[PDB]
Amino acid sequence: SRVPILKVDDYWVVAIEETLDQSVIQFKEELLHNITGVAGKGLVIDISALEVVDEFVTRVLIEISRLAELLGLPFVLTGIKPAVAITLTEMGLDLRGMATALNLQKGLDKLKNLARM
């Protein structure tokens, strides 16, 4: 448990910070364990802390995204600067077709708005 996984109003909230690499595997595993245990209304993951995004991180984000979809868990990715949007898309993450938001607040609001409909 290095990367904290928070729960707010039944939404999972995670912010990924710079890591000095197997802890990303460790993080993905713990997150997946959590979101398949107690039900939650959705998942927000913020990556604003990452100066560059790795091929490794990208694959973790693709897997979390696919599983969230299979689980029926609304998912929003937040804090994505232009340069990182380019890299993620080039490495196979479909940014256009997924929910993204500017920050954690916007992320949380987006999920609640979609649901309240």
PDB file of C-alpha atoms in Angstrom:
ATOM      1  CA  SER A   1       0.000   0.000   0.000  1.00  0.00           C
ATOM      2  CA  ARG A   2       2.246   2.805  -1.275  1.00  0.00           C
ATOM      3  CA  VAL A   3      -0.159   4.547  -3.671  1.00  0.00           C
ATOM      4  CA  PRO A   4      -3.154   5.514  -1.506  1.00  0.00           C
ATOM      5  CA  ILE A   5      -6.546   4.432  -2.750  1.00  0.00           C
ATOM      6  CA  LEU A   6      -9.245   6.715  -1.341  1.00  0.00           C
ATOM      7  CA  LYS A   7     -13.018   6.334  -1.264  1.00  0.00           C
ATOM      8  CA  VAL A   8     -15.195   9.447  -1.279  1.00  0.00           C
ATOM      9  CA  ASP A   9     -18.998   9.324  -1.341  1.00  0.00           C
ATOM     10  CA  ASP A  10     -18.637   5.747  -2.705  1.00  0.00           C
ATOM     11  CA  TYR A  11     -16.266   6.835  -5.496  1.00  0.00           C
ATOM     12  CA  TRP A  12     -12.753   5.418  -5.677  1.00  0.00           C
ATOM     13  CA  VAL A  13     -10.178   8.198  -5.966  1.00  0.00           C
ATOM     14  CA  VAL A  14      -6.511   7.700  -6.857  1.00  0.00           C
ATOM     15  CA  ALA A  15      -3.670  10.074  -7.697  1.00  0.00           C
ATOM     16  CA  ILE A  16      -0.593   8.561  -9.300  1.00  0.00           C
ATOM     17  CA  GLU A  17       2.663  10.280  -8.332  1.00  0.00           C
ATOM     18  CA  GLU A  18       6.223   9.905  -9.679  1.00  0.00           C
ATOM     19  CA  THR A  19       7.667   6.513  -8.676  1.00  0.00           C
ATOM     20  CA  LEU A  20      11.394   5.916  -8.201  1.00  0.00           C
ATOM     21  CA  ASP A  21       8.236   0.832 -11.392  1.00  0.00           C
ATOM     22  CA  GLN A  22       7.217  -2.473  -9.837  1.00  0.00           C
ATOM     23  CA  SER A  23       5.099  -0.418  -7.443  1.00  0.00           C
ATOM     24  CA  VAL A  24       2.923   0.473 -10.447  1.00  0.00           C
ATOM     25  CA  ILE A  25       2.291  -3.254 -10.832  1.00  0.00           C
ATOM     26  CA  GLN A  26       1.703  -3.336  -7.082  1.00  0.00           C
ATOM     27  CA  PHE A  27      -0.697  -0.417  -7.409  1.00  0.00           C
ATOM     28  CA  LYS A  28      -2.683  -1.925 -10.303  1.00  0.00           C
ATOM     29  CA  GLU A  29      -3.059  -5.171  -8.361  1.00  0.00           C
ATOM     30  CA  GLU A  30      -4.307  -3.476  -5.196  1.00  0.00           C
ATOM     31  CA  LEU A  31      -6.674  -1.208  -7.140  1.00  0.00           C
ATOM     32  CA  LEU A  32      -8.178  -4.126  -9.032  1.00  0.00           C
ATOM     33  CA  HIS A  33      -8.565  -6.059  -5.800  1.00  0.00           C
ATOM     34  CA  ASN A  34     -10.360  -3.100  -4.211  1.00  0.00           C
ATOM     35  CA  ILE A  35     -12.762  -2.308  -7.053  1.00  0.00           C
ATOM     36  CA  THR A  36     -13.858  -5.952  -7.314  1.00  0.00           C
ATOM     37  CA  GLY A  37     -14.604  -6.235  -3.585  1.00  0.00           C
ATOM     38  CA  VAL A  38     -16.958  -3.664  -2.120  1.00  0.00           C
ATOM     39  CA  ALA A  39     -19.140  -2.069  -4.771  1.00  0.00           C
ATOM     40  CA  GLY A  40     -18.412   1.577  -5.647  1.00  0.00           C
ATOM     41  CA  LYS A  41     -20.129   4.133  -7.873  1.00  0.00           C
ATOM     42  CA  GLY A  42     -17.073   4.847  -9.977  1.00  0.00           C
ATOM     43  CA  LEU A  43     -13.357   5.398 -10.245  1.00  0.00           C
ATOM     44  CA  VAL A  44     -11.278   8.557 -10.762  1.00  0.00           C
ATOM     45  CA  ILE A  45      -7.563   8.342 -11.461  1.00  0.00           C
ATOM     46  CA  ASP A  46      -5.392  11.459 -11.723  1.00  0.00           C
ATOM     47  CA  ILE A  47      -2.011  11.450 -13.444  1.00  0.00           C
ATOM     48  CA  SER A  48      -1.087  15.163 -13.329  1.00  0.00           C
ATOM     49  CA  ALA A  49       2.037  14.368 -11.280  1.00  0.00           C
ATOM     50  CA  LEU A  50       3.694  12.412 -14.145  1.00  0.00           C
ATOM     51  CA  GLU A  51       6.096  14.543 -16.197  1.00  0.00           C
ATOM     52  CA  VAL A  52       6.199  11.851 -18.872  1.00  0.00           C
ATOM     53  CA  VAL A  53       4.046   8.752 -19.201  1.00  0.00           C
ATOM     54  CA  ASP A  54       5.735   5.391 -19.685  1.00  0.00           C
ATOM     55  CA  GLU A  55       4.860   2.498 -21.970  1.00  0.00           C
ATOM     56  CA  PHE A  56       4.419   0.622 -18.685  1.00  0.00           C
ATOM     57  CA  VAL A  57       2.002   3.113 -17.109  1.00  0.00           C
ATOM     58  CA  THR A  58       0.061   3.243 -20.369  1.00  0.00           C
ATOM     59  CA  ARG A  59      -0.500  -0.509 -20.340  1.00  0.00           C
ATOM     60  CA  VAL A  60      -1.660  -0.355 -16.726  1.00  0.00           C
ATOM     61  CA  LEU A  61      -4.133   2.392 -17.683  1.00  0.00           C
ATOM     62  CA  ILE A  62      -5.371   0.353 -20.654  1.00  0.00           C
ATOM     63  CA  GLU A  63      -5.949  -2.691 -18.416  1.00  0.00           C
ATOM     64  CA  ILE A  64      -7.707  -0.733 -15.668  1.00  0.00           C
ATOM     65  CA  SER A  65      -9.881   0.915 -18.326  1.00  0.00           C
ATOM     66  CA  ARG A  66     -10.854  -2.419 -19.913  1.00  0.00           C
ATOM     67  CA  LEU A  67     -11.660  -4.030 -16.576  1.00  0.00           C
ATOM     68  CA  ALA A  68     -13.660  -1.025 -15.376  1.00  0.00           C
ATOM     69  CA  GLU A  69     -15.762  -1.319 -18.510  1.00  0.00           C
ATOM     70  CA  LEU A  70     -16.302  -5.083 -17.919  1.00  0.00           C
ATOM     71  CA  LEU A  71     -17.217  -4.330 -14.311  1.00  0.00           C
ATOM     72  CA  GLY A  72     -19.760  -1.673 -15.282  1.00  0.00           C
ATOM     73  CA  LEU A  73     -17.706   0.786 -13.231  1.00  0.00           C
ATOM     74  CA  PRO A  74     -17.732   4.372 -14.519  1.00  0.00           C
ATOM     75  CA  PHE A  75     -14.125   5.519 -14.962  1.00  0.00           C
ATOM     76  CA  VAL A  76     -12.591   8.956 -15.556  1.00  0.00           C
ATOM     77  CA  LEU A  77      -8.907   9.746 -16.160  1.00  0.00           C
ATOM     78  CA  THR A  78      -7.805  13.237 -15.094  1.00  0.00           C
ATOM     79  CA  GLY A  79      -4.845  15.650 -15.183  1.00  0.00           C
ATOM     80  CA  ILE A  80      -3.677  14.959 -18.756  1.00  0.00           C
ATOM     81  CA  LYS A  81      -1.478  17.645 -20.308  1.00  0.00           C
ATOM     82  CA  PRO A  82      -1.301  17.931 -24.127  1.00  0.00           C
ATOM     83  CA  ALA A  83       2.105  16.230 -24.429  1.00  0.00           C
ATOM     84  CA  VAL A  84       0.910  13.270 -22.362  1.00  0.00           C
ATOM     85  CA  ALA A  85      -2.348  12.987 -24.314  1.00  0.00           C
ATOM     86  CA  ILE A  86      -0.207  12.554 -27.424  1.00  0.00           C
ATOM     87  CA  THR A  87       1.919   9.815 -25.872  1.00  0.00           C
ATOM     88  CA  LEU A  88      -0.983   7.876 -24.332  1.00  0.00           C
ATOM     89  CA  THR A  89      -2.863   7.829 -27.639  1.00  0.00           C
ATOM     90  CA  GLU A  90       0.283   6.737 -29.507  1.00  0.00           C
ATOM     91  CA  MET A  91       0.689   3.848 -27.100  1.00  0.00           C
ATOM     92  CA  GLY A  92      -2.889   2.611 -27.658  1.00  0.00           C
ATOM     93  CA  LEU A  93      -5.113   4.297 -25.039  1.00  0.00           C
ATOM     94  CA  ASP A  94      -8.291   5.597 -26.702  1.00  0.00           C
ATOM     95  CA  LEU A  95      -8.595   9.033 -25.066  1.00  0.00           C
ATOM     96  CA  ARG A  96     -11.390  10.281 -27.340  1.00  0.00           C
ATOM     97  CA  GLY A  97     -13.726   7.454 -26.505  1.00  0.00           C
ATOM     98  CA  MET A  98     -13.205   7.550 -22.745  1.00  0.00           C
ATOM     99  CA  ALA A  99     -14.239   9.934 -19.969  1.00  0.00           C
ATOM    100  CA  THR A 100     -11.454  12.370 -19.126  1.00  0.00           C
ATOM    101  CA  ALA A 101     -11.509  15.491 -16.897  1.00  0.00           C
ATOM    102  CA  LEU A 102      -9.161  18.332 -15.975  1.00  0.00           C
ATOM    103  CA  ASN A 103      -8.705  17.460 -12.312  1.00  0.00           C
ATOM    104  CA  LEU A 104     -10.174  15.439  -9.465  1.00  0.00           C
ATOM    105  CA  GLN A 105     -13.058  17.847  -8.848  1.00  0.00           C
ATOM    106  CA  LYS A 106     -14.143  17.846 -12.508  1.00  0.00           C
ATOM    107  CA  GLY A 107     -13.614  14.072 -12.532  1.00  0.00           C
ATOM    108  CA  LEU A 108     -15.890  13.495  -9.563  1.00  0.00           C
ATOM    109  CA  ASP A 109     -18.510  15.899 -10.971  1.00  0.00           C
ATOM    110  CA  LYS A 110     -18.474  14.184 -14.369  1.00  0.00           C
ATOM    111  CA  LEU A 111     -19.200  10.789 -12.842  1.00  0.00           C
ATOM    112  CA  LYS A 112     -22.041  12.123 -10.704  1.00  0.00           C
ATOM    113  CA  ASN A 113     -23.529  13.999 -13.658  1.00  0.00           C
ATOM    114  CA  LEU A 114     -23.542  10.942 -15.927  1.00  0.00           C
ATOM    115  CA  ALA A 115     -25.141   8.893 -13.142  1.00  0.00           C
ATOM    116  CA  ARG A 116     -27.789  11.442 -12.118  1.00  0.00           C
ATOM    117  CA  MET A 117     -29.123  11.106 -15.675  1.00  0.00           C
TER     118      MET A 117
END
